[PDB]
Write a protein that binds this ligand. Structure first.
Ligand SMILES: [Zn+2]
Ligand SMILES: [Zn+2]
Ligand SMILES: [Zn+2]
Length: 100
């Protein structure tokens, strides 16, 4: 068992469903789908070294810009301490510290 041999296949025109979790994209083509999957398969070495943030990017520039959001404005800011937070729940629960 050393030799080998492979080959494609064909069948009626059916609806193909992306074998990816969450994804809701479909296509009635085997060629178009493969091209789409390319998006799911890749690599994201660049990681946001921010507190709380656990996202990642592929392009260096992409990240840089994203980071700006942290080094700028925040969708969550306290009143008393006037601090900034990434998550909402944290802010709500945080208040406790202020009050009794
Ligand atoms: Zn997909
Ligand atoms: Zn981030
Ligand atoms: Zn506060």
């Amino acid at each position: 068992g050393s030799s080998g041999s492979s080959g494609p296949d064909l069948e009626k025109r059916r609806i193909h469903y992306c074998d990816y979790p969450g994804c809701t994209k479909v296509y009635t083509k085997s060629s178009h789908l493969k091209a789409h999957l390319r998006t799911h398969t890749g690599e994201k070495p660049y990681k946001c070294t921010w507190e709380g943030c656990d996202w990642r990017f592929a392009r260096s520039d992409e990240l840089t810009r994203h980071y700006r959001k942290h080094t700028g404005a925040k969708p969550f800011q306290c009143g008393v301490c006037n601090r900034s937070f990434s998550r909402s729940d944290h802010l709500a629960l945080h208040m406790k510290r202020h009050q009794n």
